[PDB]
RNA sequence: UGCUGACAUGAGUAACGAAAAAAAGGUAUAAACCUUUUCACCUAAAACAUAAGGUUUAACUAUAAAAGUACGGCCCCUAA
RNA sequence: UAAAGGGAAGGAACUCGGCAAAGAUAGCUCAUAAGUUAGUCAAUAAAGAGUAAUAAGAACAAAGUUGUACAACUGUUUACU
RNA sequence: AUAAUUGAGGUCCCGCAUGAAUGACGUAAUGAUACAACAACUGUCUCCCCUUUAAGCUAAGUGAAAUUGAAAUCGUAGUGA
RNA sequence: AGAGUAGAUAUUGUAAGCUAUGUUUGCCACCUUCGACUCAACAUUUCCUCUUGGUUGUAAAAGCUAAGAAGGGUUUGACUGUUCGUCAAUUAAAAUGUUACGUGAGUUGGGUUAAAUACGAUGUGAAUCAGUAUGGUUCCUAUCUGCUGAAGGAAAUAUUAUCAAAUUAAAUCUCAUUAUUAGUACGCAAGGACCAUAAUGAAUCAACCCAUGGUGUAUCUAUUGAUAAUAAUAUAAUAUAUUUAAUAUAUUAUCUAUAUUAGUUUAUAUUUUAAUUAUAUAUUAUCAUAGUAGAUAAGCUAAGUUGAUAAUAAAUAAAUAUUGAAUACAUAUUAAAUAUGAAGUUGUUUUAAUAAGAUAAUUAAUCUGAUAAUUUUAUACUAAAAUUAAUAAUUAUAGGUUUUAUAUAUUAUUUAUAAUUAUAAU
């Protein structure tokens, strides 16, 4: 059930980094993207190009932002009177700063 | 039970629900992104559904027709945005594949997602019309778009087209009229140019497209095979 | 296939009605089943007024176990497992006739060499 | 022998049919058997198809599976065609209930 | 089997706590946040009203509105 | 490994011990002995019938009979063996 | 009573060392009590097989525990707190 | 000594003698759990099977006793916590041990040393017992050794692809019954062989899935109860085009099956009244253990199938011999020579590892491998194995597609083609 002795620095090292299985291999399998000569994994669509395509689709197949009929011609003063902007809670604020906790896809290097 | 299909770490009913759902979504949107495994199974379903639809369209036997229809109904959730899906399958989707023998769906490997390392894929219907009127382009077939982009890049660089690219183009063509294909390419190209920084000369582009089509359409070791002495 | 305290029909006129297998004779391990053609020791559990309680020998003549394979690629299975009482050291039927009411048996008995039993039987299937 | 058991033949053998299996006398010395077909066992390949048929003989049942293409069997004669009442492909369910076969030999007399 | 602090070993191991998810869009930022649709789960409840309790946790600082009648306290009256 | 489902021929041969797991042929209406402290206590008696059902066919209530020892009985007890 | 019984029930009385409110004696009912027998039913077993789900396994994210004189920690025979 | 119809030494063997073992009951005080299940490993003082000597007590057959021999094998029940023991049924036999009286970080916990309680006994009593009875508590994710598998690296008498011997590590090694020889030998009769062969099986092991049986959360059908859909049809609204003289007709699309009021408090239901607010319509789906039941393809499996139980041979053990001295005889040799002789040994057979040797290739428009993709013969991960064709040819890996086949359960009262009729057939 339990270790009989403190495992020596050597022994643990050799258990961990010793065998091949436990080592990270080098990703040899990667090649040029036909559309823009950047690196991409083999047998795999380039993540930039596809993303771009998706974006374009979104732009084209964008749904109509259903803006209400009343609020478009609603006086600024009137609006202020109606809907005064409150202070948001800490949690809400945190949620809002997406950049802090949310990751945007990185771009690869150019293959040569 | 063991080894007939994927299990996907879900009990029977739930799995079935998932797969039907995925099929429905694919029919709706033409292209979707999900985990590889899910895609792979979803395609199986979708293809089968398409074939059933085709059979229903074709076969003279009323009994057979009815049965196929029933099967199709069973294999879908026709409720919210899928309410008119039955109609869509027969009228819009199935006809595109009347001449094509299987292979109605295309699965393409993406990058594994960062947070989970789960291997992802695009699943999409093959020959999906890229141009809807009163809309410009449609949320269509990624592969075609990618090919077009590649072609554009090549043109920009003034390099010859890769053989692989040519092969892909040929494949795309096989079940496609030439003029139609050309039109589609043209439609794609302008949009791509707009997206990218590159400029757009219409006539020149058209010419290029024509050239590309022509090559596609009109077709053209150390070991010596010798008889036993 | 018959095992320890399996109960079986006696299809004989010895007066035994129902017998309970206590051992299989030729087979080495006591865990092993007795099948058609095999000789068993049994206790006589029920009899018409030999007596109940008598330990006697019997041959299993038919079984309910489908799966028993014949060389011609066929199988036969019965509605019950039945036996015929025999004589300890003679190996002949203890009864004079097999009950013609319910006296079918497996032709494998003939192959085995239980000719007396086979002839005694109303039908050999 | 193939024609009966063909899924394309209308007048085939069905669960419910009573049949007489006649063995060849030159090959073997087996008696002919009459039985109600509970099931025809069709297989991936053809020659190893069989049928499972039963008969009650004077207060005792007996079921037999016969390999239909065994050269031991000469021909099989349809005695009685099935009735439209009992429905299903395989009639195992009848054994032990009201629907059981009874004595086919007796019926024949 | 000192005491305190720091740092190891087991070990990047076990586990991550009753479990149904999917797509599209927010957002070429999302398994986990929000919205829509699909699917499911609880339903003499996992719902809707409440009592007690408590770092106000809430749909929040521009904040939880009462003369009283199927509104409670205090108040009057007592029980233990 | 856990929590389930099914299982031919056997049917307790298992085991300290049928532990565990099977096992319900109306849940309504009839019909229900011996014994007995005379309380349908026994009794929701067992068995059995009426309606339903003829081998394909929800879930839940409902799981036997008898002998002996001890204690009348419903209750209470070592929160955590 | 079982094919076969150190168990069970009945009876016999050298009660090693019963006995009358530390109650004595037989009974109905009751008991998740404790022994035993029969029926039925079964994976308990002959004898294990298949299937499902959650784990285990791999990838990503997080990330414990008892233990630890120091270890470069094989077998055998002999030796020896 | 003495038994043994005679005669100590076939078989028996008093008391006394000399030893061996550390399997019992003890003694010492160096040192602080019995059974069951599972899996067994080792020993030989051998229970069976193989070889053999002795046997007025070897006629034969059964035995008794002794030598060699550990290759294979050595049981299922009732009783009991039991190991044991008493029976029952078998078996060739049901051998005796050692392994912390093997095995609780492998299971169980019935016995047995706690707390509750009772009975008998002892005690004035609290309580006690080489008593009896019911109940009743430990857990552990494996660091190292070890073992079972599977990889990576590596040094190769120097490479790669493939084939690979010796060898090393193991496995295996059998047994019964029946029949023949033969009712022969032997024997008054009863009884009844060796030697040797064959056929059945027995246990054990391996492989397999054509069939058989099981399963089969992919497989359809049947079915109970509730809900939610899609399509069709009737109704209504709105939107969009058409015709008509915004209106009406009809076409297309979308949305809609509501809602309010009565019937003495509430809630629900019913019916009326209001409203366009519907189908004993087709087909689905969800949930109820896969809701339940009948069948069920692949795969996996045994209760199934198939095969093996490894020869021939070499040297031997106990034993049985030939000649033959030392020692004029005798002596199978603890002399020289020459022979028979066991399920044992060596070997063979089987699996795994290793890789001597062999064939070929050599810096490469497609050298040998890896990474990568699709995968299953393979699989925890790996590894193994198949494919990565799309050009002058040739090669299908998974999914799909087609094919025939299977599975389901209705179908000739049918489908298809031509005009209730003709032909081809499910
Ligand atoms: Mg210190
Ligand atoms: Mg570890
Ligand atoms: Mg682990
Ligand atoms: Mg884990
Ligand atoms: Mg959780
Ligand atoms: Mg997103
Ligand atoms: Mg309700
Ligand atoms: Mg609430
Ligand atoms: Mg036992
Ligand atoms: Mg027992
Ligand atoms: Mg109940
Ligand atoms: Mg009481
Ligand atoms: Mg008392
Ligand atoms: Mg009580
Ligand atoms: Mg991890
Ligand atoms: Mg010896
Ligand atoms: Mg241990
Ligand atoms: Mg230990
Ligand atoms: Mg208890
Ligand atoms: Mg099979
Ligand atoms: Mg099968
Ligand atoms: Mg529910
Ligand atoms: Mg065999
Ligand atoms: Mg080809
Ligand atoms: Zn790119």
Distance of CA A104 to the CA centre of its chain: 4
Q: Which residue in D86, D89, D88, D109 sits closest to D101, CA to CA?
A: D86
Method: cryo-EM
The answer to whether B153 contacts A35, with C-beta atoms less than 8 Å apart, is yes
Among the partner-chain residues C72, C78, C107, the one whose CB lies closest to the CB of D60 is C78
The closest alpha carbon to D106, from D62, D61, D57, belongs to: D57
DSSP characters for C35-53? -TT-EEEEEEEEE----TT
Q: Suggest the residue from B111, B132, B136 to mutate for an interface test with chain A (most A CBs closer than 10 A).
A: B111
Nearest to A110 by CA among A45, A12, A37: A37
Determine which of B149, B152, B190 to mutate to test the interface with A (most A C-beta atoms within 10 Å): B149
Q: Identify which of B145, B23, B176 has the alpha carbon closest to the alpha carbon of residue B85.
A: B23
User: Cα–Cα–Cα angle for A39, A42, A43, nearest 5°?
Assistant: 135
The DSSP output letter for D101 is -
Give the residue among B47, B50, B18, B49 at the shortest CA–CA distance from B34: B18
Which of C29, C80, C25 shows the shortest CA–CA distance to C58? C25
Rg (C-alpha) for chain B, rounded Å, is 21
Strand order, beta sheet including B120-125: B31-35, B120-125, B105-109
Residues in chain D: 109
Distance CA B167, CA B155 (A): 17
Alpha-carbon distance of B114 to D109, in angstroms, equals 82
| C-beta separation of C83 from C74 below 8 A | no
Do chains B and A touch by CB distance (3+ pairs < 8 Å)?
A: yes
> What's the rounded Cα separation, in Å, for the pair D50 and D19?
13
Bridge partners of D77, per DSSP, are D20
Give me B103's structure tokens: 């292979």
Ligand 23 center–CA B106 separation, angstroms:
53
CB A60 within 8 A of CB A70: no
**How large is the C-alpha radius of gyration of chain C?**
13
Residue B24: how many other CB atoms lie within 10 Å: 23
By C-alpha distance, which of D16, D59, D23, D22 is closest to D40?
A: D16
Calpha distance D41→D14 (Å, rounded): 11
According to DSSP, the residues that pair with C60 across neighbouring strands are: C83
Q: Chain D residues with CB inside 8 Å of C102's CB?
A: 57-60
Interacting residues of B3 by C-beta distance below 8 A, sequence separation 6+: none
Supply φ then ψ for residue D57, to 5 degrees: -120, 105
Number of inter-chain CB pairs under 8 A, C vs D: 49
Minimal CA–CA distance to B122: which of B97, B139, B99?
A: B139
Give residue C34 CA to ligand 10 midpoint distance, Å.
21
| Residue where the block lists tokens 């003549």 | C61
Residue A30 φ then ψ, to 5°? -160, 145
B120, two tokens? 């992802």
| Triad B50, B52, B57: Cα angle to 5° | 95
DSSP D70-97: -TTEEEEEEEEPPPSSS-SS--GGGTTS
Q: Nearest residue to H365, CA vs C1'?
A: B221
Distance of CA B205 to the CA centre of its chain: 25
What are phi and psi for residue B104, nearest 5 degrees? Answer: -85, -20
Written as six digits, the tokens of B213 are 């089509």
Q: What Cα–Cα distance (Å) separates residue A106 from each residue in A51, B116, B117?
A: 12, 17, 16
Distance of C1' in H64 from CA in B49, Å:
90
- Which residues pair with residue D3 across a beta bridge? none
Longest dimension (CA), chain A: 80
| SS3 labels along B108-173 | EECCCCCCCCCCEEEEEECCCCCCCCCCCCCCCCHHHHHHHHHHHHHHHHCCCCCHHHHHHHHHHH
DSSP A86: P
Question: With contact defined as beta carbons under 8 Å apart, do B72 and B49 qualify?
Answer: yes
> Which of C75, C104, C122 is nearest residue D65 as measured by Cβ atoms?
C75
CA distance B213 to B210: 5
Quick one: which of C45, C13, C11, C8 has its CA closest to C24?
A: C8
3-state DSSP assignment of residue C105 = strand
All residues at 6 or more sequence positions from D41 whose CB lies less than 8 Å from its CB, including other chains: D49, D50, D51, D52, D65
Of D38, A45, A112, A105, which is closest to residue B145 (Cα–Cα)? A45
| Burial zone of B140 (CB within 10 Å; 0-12 exposed, 13-18 middle, 19+ buried) | buried
State residue D78 phi and psi, 5-degree precision. Answer: -70, 115
For B86, the token pair is: 């039955």
Q: Are B124 and B105 in contact (CB under 8 A)?
A: yes
**DSSP structure string for chain B:** -TTSS--TTS-HHHHHHHHHHHHHHHHHHSEEEEEHHHHHHHHHHHHHHHHHHHHHHH---HHHHHHHHHHHHHTS--SSSSTTHHHHIIIIIGGGGSS--S--EEEEE-PPPTTT---EEEEEESS-----TTTSS-S--HHHHHHHHHHHHHHHHTPPPPHHHHHHHHHHHHTS-HHHHHHHHHHHHHHHHHHSS----HHHHHHHHHHHHHHHHS-----------
3-state secondary structure of A108: coil
Of residues C31, C97, C21, the one with CA closest to residue C59: C21
- With left for phi above 0 and alpha for psi between -120 and 50, is residue D79 left, alpha or beta? alpha
Count CB atoms within 10 A of the CB of residue A66.
Answer: 6
Helix (H) / strand (E) containing A95: helix A90-96
> Does A49 show up as a binding residue in the annotation?
yes
Cβ contact B104:B125 at 8 Å: yes
Enter the DSSP assignment of D98: T
Q: With CA atoms as reference, report the closest residue to B121 among B33, B222, B220, B30.
A: B33
């Amino acid at each position: 059930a339990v270790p009989k002795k403190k495992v020596s620095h050597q022994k643990k090292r050799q258990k961990l980094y010793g065998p091949g299985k436990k080592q990270l291999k080098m990703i040899h399998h990667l090649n040029k993207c036909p559309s823009c000569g950047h690196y991409k994994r083999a047998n795999t669509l380039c993540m930039y190009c596809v993303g771009q395509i998706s974006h374009i689709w979104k732009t084209h197949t964008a749904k109509e932002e259903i803006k209400p009929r009343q609020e478009e011609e609603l006086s600024e003063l009137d609006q202020r009177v109606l809907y005064p902007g409150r202070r948001d809670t800490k949690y809400t604020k945190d949620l809002k700063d997406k950049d802090n906790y949310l990751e945007r896809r990185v771009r690869t290097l150019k293959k040569d | 039970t063991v080894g007939i299909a994927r299990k996907l770490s879900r009990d029977k009913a739930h799995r079935d629900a998932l797969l039907k759902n995925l099929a429905c979504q694919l029919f709706q949107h033409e292209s979707i992104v999900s985990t590889h495994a899910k895609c792979k199974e979803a395609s199986r379903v979708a293809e089968r559904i398409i074939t059933w639809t085709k059979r229903a369209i074709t076969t003279s036997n009323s009994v057979a027709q009815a049965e196929l229809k029933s099967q199709i109904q069973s294999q879908l959730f026709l409720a919210g945005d899928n309410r008119k899906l039955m109609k869509r399958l027969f009228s819009e989707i199935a006809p595109r594949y009347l001449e094509r023998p299987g292979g109605y769906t295309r699965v393409l490997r993406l990058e594994p997602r960062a947070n989970d390392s789960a291997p992802q894929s695009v699943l999409e219907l093959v020959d999906s019309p890229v141009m809807s009127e009163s809309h410009t382009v449609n949320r269509g077939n990624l592969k075609m778009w990618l090919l077009v982009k590649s072609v554009i890049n090549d043109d920009a660089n003034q390099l010859p087209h890769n053989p692989l690219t040519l092969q892909n183009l040929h494949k795309v063509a096989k079940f496609k009229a030439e003029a139609q294909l050309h039109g589609e390419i043209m439609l794609i190209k302008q949009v791509l140019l707009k997206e990218m920084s590159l400029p757009y000369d219409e006539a020149l582009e058209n010419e290029r497209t024509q050239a590309l089509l022509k090559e596609v359409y009109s077709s053209s070791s150390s070991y010596v095979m010798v008889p036993r002495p | 296939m018959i095992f320890l305290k399996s109960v079986i029909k006696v299809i004989d006129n010895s007066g035994a009605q129902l017998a309970e297998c206590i051992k299989v004779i030729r087979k080495g391990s006591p865990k092993s089943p007795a099948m058609v053609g095999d000789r068993i020791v049994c206790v006589i559990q029920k009899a018409k007024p030999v007596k109940k309680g008598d330990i006697c020998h019997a041959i299993v003549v038919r079984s309910k176990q489908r799966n028993m394979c014949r060389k011609d690629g066929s199988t036969v299975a019965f509605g019950d497992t039945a036996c015929v009482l025999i004589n300890k050291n003679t190996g002949e039927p203890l009864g004079t006739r097999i009950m013609a009411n319910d006296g079918c048996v497996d032709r494998t008995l003939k192959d085995k060499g239980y000719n007396k039993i086979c002839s005694l039987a109303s039908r050999v299937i | 022998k193939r024609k009966l058991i063909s899924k394309k033949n209308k007048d085939r053998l069905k669960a419910g049919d009573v049949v007489r299996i006649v063995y060849d006398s030159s090959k073997c010395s087996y008696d002919t058997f009459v039985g109600y077909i509970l099931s025809i066992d069709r297989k991936q390949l053809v020659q190893d198809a069989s049928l499972l048929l039963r008969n009650q003989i004077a207060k005792t049942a007996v079921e037999i599976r016969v390999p239909l293409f065994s050269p031991l069997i000469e021909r099989i004669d349809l005695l009685t065609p099935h009735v439209s009442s009992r429905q299903r492909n395989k009639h195992y369910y009848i054994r032990g209930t009201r629907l059981d076969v009874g004595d086919l030999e007796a019926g024949l007399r």
